[PDB]
């Protein structure tokens, strides 16, 4: 004979009060199973008595990490103090129904007047809490703010991540998406620089013949203004652009003096210098990505970084998909991702598999094993020269 | 939906009161046909599948206005035989199936508590309050309503029961803690005006347990002081205020709230020659606070808010008033 029952869910814990309790001899009967199916014949059994939601996801996380371990929380003790009639079991008891046996023992030890029935032992309270878990969306919907699906989703993620310690040694997404960004904007830098090179050599065609390194081309067409306004070493720029006094600026200016290209307008020069500012901003962002990605690679997988070099190492990581996939692959699959060249390739694949599994399966990895394997590859590079 | 067969019982229950009203000369027969049609439409709306707490409240308001109308008409036609007990019983029935259908609506719970308190039902009010607190334990308004009505009745042990379970539950916001300190010091003022309690150590204990709560900010302790600073006419009020100030000074040393309680400490029970003396003391504290190393914009906003509170009172001198304006304007 049950009086009340606890029921804990991801939004909070609610205790129901049973009226017209379930038949215990005909629990395996088809009419009683159909009654437990239909909400119109199970809501006559249960009536919602109290509800306690969590204050925050931190409290829900503490709630699971206490309840699954077995120990009851202080706010569950609080809500039971509030909802149950205060007795001690000398002349009248209260039967509570709980899902877990350790929680049953602890609630009975905290409240001596409450006899708890566990769902793991008693079939009546098992079927009754099973029906409440069946109809739990509709029994709470008058005070169910939102849904239960996203709450269970986020709470299962928080519980699993707290059990696993996931975020402290999962770090590879920054590396693989940084490789994707680096290649995409390297292509975009080269394409925008080719576009500004053609569309400014239409105006001044000596700059393509006399100046390479298209980033420095974008800088000199940012600083040069028009064809008419040239002077060599005016202020702050060309001395640290390139050689200053006797080598380059004179040649650019005599190229402007003998220059024959089409005269450009002010608004067209404005648009070309806007495109050059765009290209050099993307180049500055490329060097910021390269520095930050070298630092992140030395934080995540330093052995692969020292045996391969960080661009090709992080390319290999991104093509494998993750460090866990890279470590699970053997050395021949890492070959997939004359004779001396293939021999050094197989040896490098073996040592790169060893470096990948060492750098992955550490908590916070090291440097010296990659240093040892790079010394081993260097002494093999010395070894193949004797023959 | 068996709603016709379900509402048949409530109409057949309300019928003999209409028979008594027809056999008296109070409602005529066309008016009683109108009452029958309106109660029938209300019952078939109430017992419908898709219903609402505003629908239950519209039916409650109609039945209660019908009771008031019949009371006016009965006093006008000079009858004393007709009683309001059947109308109160059916209004309690409407409210009970209302809180059965929608237990998660505090507007309907508070309307139920207002009705049960208004027609003199104290024991029923306590039972409804217990059910509402069990369903909404995180509601500081319900907890303060329970505790304040038990203190207004005078059962201070029951008021403490409701308040300590409320402070056991509602620990995210300071609101119920401030209201409990307010109720305990109001009990202290009642114990003083009736002339342990001689020490008055319970708000100091409330502060000492509130020191470790998840709302424990300097703004929350300033809210504690702004609660405590009212009704200073007591015995251990200087003890409580001084303990709050030394707690805030030992914990949050250079906060603008702590400098504000350093400003506004010595004006506890003042209204009168002791008023401008303590005002000059507090203005010395305020000038030291303004020159001292604290976030001056935050402290100045606190002081211009308190100075609006100062300017809200009459009966002062114009030189003091204009120097408050002069010290206000450059903030």
């Amino acid at each position: 004979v049950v009086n009340f029952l606890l029921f804990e869910s991801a939004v909070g814990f609610s205790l129901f009060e049973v009226v017209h309790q379930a038949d215990t001899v005909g629990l395996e009967l088809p009419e009683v199973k159909d009654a437990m199916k239909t909400l119109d014949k199970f809501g006559k059994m249960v009536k919602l008595r109290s509800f306690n939601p969590w204050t925050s996801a931190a409290q829900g996380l503490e709630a699971i990490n206490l309840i699954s371990e077995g120990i009851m929380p202080e706010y569950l003790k609080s809500a039971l103090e509030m909802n149950l009639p205060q007795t001690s079991g000398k002349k009248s008891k209260v039967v509570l129904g709980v899902a877990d046996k350790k929680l049953a023992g602890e609630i009975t030890a905290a409240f001596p007047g409450v006899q708890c029935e566990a769902a793991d032992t008693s079939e009546v309270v098992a079927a009754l809490l099973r029906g409440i878990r069946t109809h739990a969306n509709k029994l709470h919907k008058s005070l169910q703010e939102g849904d239960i699906g996203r709450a269970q989703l986020g709470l299962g993620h928080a519980y699993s991540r707290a059990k696993v310690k996931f975020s402290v040694h999962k770090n590879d997404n920054h590396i693989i998406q940084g490789i994707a960004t680096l290649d995409a904007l390297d292509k975009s830098i080269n394409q925008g620089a080719m576009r500004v090179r053609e569309w400014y050599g239409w105006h001044f065609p000596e700059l393509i013949r006399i100046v390479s390194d298209n980033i420095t081309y974008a800088k000199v067409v940012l600083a040069i203004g028009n064809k008419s306004s040239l002077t060599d070493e005016s202020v702050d720029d060309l001395a640290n652009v390139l050689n200053q006094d006797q080598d380059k600026a004179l040649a650019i200016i005599q190229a402007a003096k003998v220059s024959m290209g089409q005269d450009i307008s002010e608004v067209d020069l404005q648009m070309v210098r806007d495109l050059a500012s765009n290209v050099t901003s993307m180049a500055d962002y490329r060097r910021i990505l390269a520095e930050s990605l070298d630092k992140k690679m030395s934080e995540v997988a330093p052995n692969l970084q020292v045996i391969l070099g960080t661009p090709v190492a992080a390319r290999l990581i991104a093509h494998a998909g993750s460090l866990t996939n890279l470590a699970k692959y053997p050395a021949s699959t890492l070959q997939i991702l004359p004779k001396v060249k293939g021999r050094i390739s197989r040896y490098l694949a073996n040592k790169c598999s060893i470096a990948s599994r060492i750098d992955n399966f550490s908590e916070k990895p090291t440097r010296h094993f990659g240093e040892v394997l790079r010394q081993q590859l260097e002494q093999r590079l010395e070894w193949y020269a004797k023959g | 939906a068996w709603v016709a067969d379900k509402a048949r019982f409530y109409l057949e229950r309300a019928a003999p009161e209409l028979r008594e009203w027809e056999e008296k000369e109070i409602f005529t027969k066309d008016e009683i046909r109108n009452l029958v049609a309106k109660r029938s439409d209300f019952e078939h709306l109430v017992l419908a599948p898709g219903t609402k707490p505003t629908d239950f409240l519209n039916y409650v308001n109609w039945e209660r206005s019908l009771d008031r109308l019949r009371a006016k008409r009965c006093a006008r036609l000079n009858i004393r035989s007709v009683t309001s007990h059947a109308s109160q019983a059916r209004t309690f029935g409407i409210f009970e199936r209302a809180v059965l259908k929608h237990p998660g609506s505090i507007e309907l719970w508070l309307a139920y508590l207002e009705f049960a308190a208004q027609v003199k039902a104290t024991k029923r009010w306590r039972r409804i309050m217990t059910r509402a607190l069990r369903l909404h334990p995180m509601n500081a308004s319900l907890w303060t309503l329970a505790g304040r009505r038990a203190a207004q009745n005078g059962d201070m042990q029951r008021a403490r029961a409701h308040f300590l379970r409320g402070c056991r539950f509602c620990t995210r916001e300071p609101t119920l803690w401030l209201e409990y300190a307010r109720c305990e010091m109001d009990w202290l003022a009642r114990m003083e005006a009736k002339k342990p309690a001689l020490s008055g150590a319970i708000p100091i204990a409330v502060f000492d347990v509130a020191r470790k709560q998840p709302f424990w900010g300097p703004a929350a302790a300033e809210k504690f002081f702004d609660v405590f600073a009212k009704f200073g006419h007591l015995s251990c009020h200087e003890r409580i205020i001084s303990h709050v100030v030394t707690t805030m000074q030992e914990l949050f040393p250079n906060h603008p709230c702590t400098w504000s309680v350093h400003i506004r400490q010595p004006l506890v029970g003042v209204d009168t020659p002791a008023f401008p003396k303590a005002l000059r003391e507090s203005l010395a504290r305020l000038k030291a606070a303004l020159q001292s190393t604290t976030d001056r914009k935050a402290l100045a906003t606190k002081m211009v808010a308190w100075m609006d509170g100062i300017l809200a009172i009459e009966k002062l001198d114009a030189a003091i008033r204009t120097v408050l304006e002069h010290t206000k304007r450059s903030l």
């Binding site: 509030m82 | 607190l133 403490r160 402070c167």
Partner: peptide
Amino acid sequence: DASELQPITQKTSGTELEQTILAIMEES
């Protein structure tokens, strides 16, 4: 009877608040 919320005692006192308040009222 679970009709109302009974006054707390030392048996049904949970937190440090209720322990300290009951200690003060016991010393009263």
